[PDB]
Amino acid sequence: APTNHQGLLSWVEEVAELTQPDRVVFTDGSEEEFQRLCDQLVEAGTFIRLNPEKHKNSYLALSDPSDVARVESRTYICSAKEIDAGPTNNWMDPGEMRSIMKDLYRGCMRGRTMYVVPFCMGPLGAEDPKLGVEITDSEYVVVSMRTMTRMGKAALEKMGDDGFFVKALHSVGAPLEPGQKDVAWPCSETKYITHFPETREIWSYGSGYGGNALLGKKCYSLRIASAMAHDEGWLAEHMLILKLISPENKAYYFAAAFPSACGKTNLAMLQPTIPGWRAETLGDDIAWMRFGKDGRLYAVNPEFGFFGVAPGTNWKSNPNAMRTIAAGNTVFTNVALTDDGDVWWEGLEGDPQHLIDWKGNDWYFRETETNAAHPNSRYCTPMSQCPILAPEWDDPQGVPISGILFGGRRKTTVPLVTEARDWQHGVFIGATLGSEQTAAAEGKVGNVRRDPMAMLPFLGYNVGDYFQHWINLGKHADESKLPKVFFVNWFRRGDDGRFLWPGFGENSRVLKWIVDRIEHKAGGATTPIGTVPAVEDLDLDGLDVDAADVAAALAVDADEWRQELPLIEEWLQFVGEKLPTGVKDEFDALKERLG
Ligand SMILES: Nc1nc2c(ncn2[C@@H]2O[C@H](COP(=O)(O)OP(=O)(O)O)[C@@H](O)[C@H]2O)c(=O)[nH]1
Ligand SMILES: [Mn+2]
Ligand SMILES: [Zn+2]
Known part of the structure; x- marks a missing residue:
């Protein structure tokens, strides 16, 4: 491991002993690492590589249809006292929650690689950079975290030897037994997205999708951060x-x-x-x-990136979003695939008569009764590509x-x-x-x-x-x-x-x-x-x-x-x-x- 932060190392050990992964990997955020993770995602079937001519270095991922559901009732603020979560939040006693989630986490990463993803929220040059480390067994999460945050080596160095950081634990909750064949999009029927505000910790389990799994997007940026801002002014x-x-x-x-x-x-x-x-x-x-x-x-x-809603987006409605996407390096989740290997979604110009929908099924113009792209499908793209x-x-x-x-x-x-x-x-x-x-x-x-x-x-x-x-x-x-x-x-x-x-x-x-x-x-x-x-x-x-x-x-x-x-x-x-x-x-x- 490329750090001497002993607090960090101890945490990784403690977690790995619980989840029992095949191995642990620290991510550095480099372009060769990125290309390597994508290649592996293509091999697993989680990504398909989009026709290079229309999109440079861009990928389509189709999720398990049960993992796109709204999960507000599974999202928790576990402060010591219920009053400190309040009527807009779902509360559970922190001890009770831990006992639930520790049971879930024990052995959960069996047969999988466990990634340790250091990242910075906000510019590195800041005086108090808000740092976090996300542990996840999802390669998809690693790739998307790279786009959505300042990920890797720089944030790890900014952590020093005893710098504070948000502990963000994530697992898709699908352990593999030695024989077992994986699926492109593993997840669990049991989902928790839990926040421990006093300690600044995020525990997510069971979903590999969006704000449930990319723990900077909402979990850090608003839930934990609003608690920090509360205390810090x-x-x-x-x-x-x-x-x-x-x-x-x-x-x-x-x-x-x-x-x-x-x-x-x-x-x-x-x-x-x-x-x-x-x-x-x-x-x-x-x-x-x-x-x-x-x-x-x-x-x-x-x-550090945009996690925008695809459907509705087009050259008339949002030419700037389209130009951002055109520059490539984008991951589309749950959109459709055209006959020439382009991506499509309701509202996008063009009139495709046949598509492969977001569940891998054939879709036909003025026939198929379901949307070709999920109605809340997403693109994940670098901010710096926005003109x-x-x-x-x-x-x-x-x-x-x-x-x-x-x-x-x-x-x-x-x-x-x-x-x-x-x-x-x-x-x-x-x-x-x-x-x-x-x-x-x-x-x-x-x-x-x-x-x-x-x-x-x-x-x-x-x-x-x-x-x-x-x-x-x-x-x-x-x-x-x-x-x-x-x-x-x-x-x-x-x-x-x-x-x-x-x-x-x-x-x-x-x-x-x-x-x-x-x-x-x-x-x-x-x-x-x-x-x-x-x-x-x-x-x-x-x-x-x-x-x-x-x-x-x-x-x-x-x-x-x-x-x-x-x-x-x-x-x-x-x-x-x-x-x-x-x-x-x-x-x-x-x-x-x-x-
Ligand atoms: N009538 C009207 N509709 C709008 C306006 N701005 C956005 N919308 C519509 O509201 C919906 C959501 O817009 P969007 O910008 O994606 O909202 P966001 O989810 O908060 O980012 C889209 O269908 C837009 O067409 C507006 O100024 N007037
Ligand atoms: Mn939006
Ligand atoms: Zn939002």
């Missing part, structure tokens, strides 16, 4: 980071939290529609925000945030854009973020789900304490230096069910109002829920849209808002005993202004 958030550049060439940085399927990728890849405006991205999922010497809040993307990546993406100091945006899907009630009255009000609007989405295993059609700061399934501690944490950071900061907070809604619909606002690139007009507000040069009316622009405060020059529709999108109707109040109240009761008085005070204030 910063923010680990589900936010894209956008760099907006004015015609006068001034850069404004925004962090925006939207729940999944509410537009984070599209805003991150914004192509402004107002002449002279440009946009670049630093990330579309996770933001780590820390106060600098400036007194300003600086954001860094702790990830609109901002040059400061690998800057350990991060970028100063001028604005924080919250938003979700609301057919009614919530205006296109609102500015918060002040920081505490901003925390309130984040805290009560609603979105008209639901899932199978939940049902509840028509429901308004509250997804606080877009963090409902990602908080590593009590949601009330989290709100208090947000409150405290602002309370103790230079008020003038804090980002302004904004609430947006792209999804308001008219009486006919049309979108009142066209959105996508035209959202650059909303961001322009936001910039203008930052620069103290735009108007906005005081309403009960905040400052909302009139239609003439927005730049609609060049936009073929009905002024009356824009006015409706911006409307704050006191009745709609009064009907909204009992929804907010029952959410705030659900938050429970740790609901901060600051959030309570803001609800009362809102109620008073609505009268």
Whole structure:
């Protein structure tokens, strides 16, 4: 082993004695190692190599269809006390959990190689690099971790001899007995994704898929990290980071939290529609925000790659995503395969009459009743291949945030854009973020789900304490230096069910109002829920849209808002005993202004 970190070595020994793998392998993150792992993945049938002419060094992997299921009920925050997980989290006593998972882990890696994968979340040049080591028996995980994090030799050296690091244990939970033939995608029917916040540990078992197995993606970046940030005085958030550049060439940085399927990728890849405006991205999922010497809040993307949703993506919908993929070095999971060895998914241009679907079965145009690609299939691709990546993406100091945006899907009630009255009000609007989405295993059609700061399934501690944490950071900061907070809604619909606002690139007009507000040069009316622009405060020059529709999108109707109040109240009761008085005070204030 290429290290003298004895704490690390002891942990590897202890784990290997439990899981009993055939051998242990430390990964260094080199290109020859990568090519070697891929070659082995092709041999196992886990990867198929894509036609080099269309894709350089790119692969397709098809998972076991039972391993793509949503696993929120199998995801746990195992703090010592239940109150410290809170009502948004699944809790189990830590001792009870360990006894369950130790039973599962004992002998689990029999007949398999056990990889030890060191990695860095965020740029290496940082002063306190957040380091982790993932142990996994999945080669697929190793390859994808290489793309999604700064993996290997550099992070291992940054660990020194006694540097702290997050212990991330993973197993697919499919031991092989000496005779046994493996399968392309091993996994178990028993799945746990468990987090021990006080010790900063992640124990995953039974799934080899996505955020369950690539332990930097959500487990580290939000769950464990939010707990760290809680204790250390910063923010680990589900936010894209956008760099907006004015015609006068001034850069404004925004962090925006939207729940999944509410537009984070599209805003991150914004192509402004107002002449002279440009946009670049630093990330579309996770933001780590820390106060600098400036007194300003600086954001860094702790990830190194994109794990984007394939279906829906095309040269019209997202040319920048397509260009990122075209450069190669990409792993597609659960998409379809064309007759000429290209990949395809619903929404991608082309009209393939026959495909091989994501289960290896023949698929036929206007015949086969199932999607060719899984509806939440993924591509995993390097960030550095993104043509609109901002040059400061690998800057350990991060970028100063001028604005924080919250938003979700609301057919009614919530205006296109609102500015918060002040920081505490901003925390309130984040805290009560609603979105008209639901899932199978939940049902509840028509429901308004509250997804606080877009963090409902990602908080590593009590949601009330989290709100208090947000409150405290602002309370103790230079008020003038804090980002302004904004609430947006792209999804308001008219009486006919049309979108009142066209959105996508035209959202650059909303961001322009936001910039203008930052620069103290735009108007906005005081309403009960905040400052909302009139239609003439927005730049609609060049936009073929009905002024009356824009006015409706911006409307704050006191009745709609009064009907909204009992929804907010029952959410705030659900938050429970740790609901901060600051959030309570803001609800009362809102109620008073609505009268
Ligand atoms: N009407 C409308 N739809 C949008 C807008 N932005 C994104 N969407 C749609 O919302 C869905 C999810 O968008 P995406 O950017 O992938 O969301 P993400 O999962 O949060 O990254 C897609 O079907 C988009 O077409 C918008 O500004 N207006
Ligand atoms: Mn996305
Ligand atoms: Zn996400």
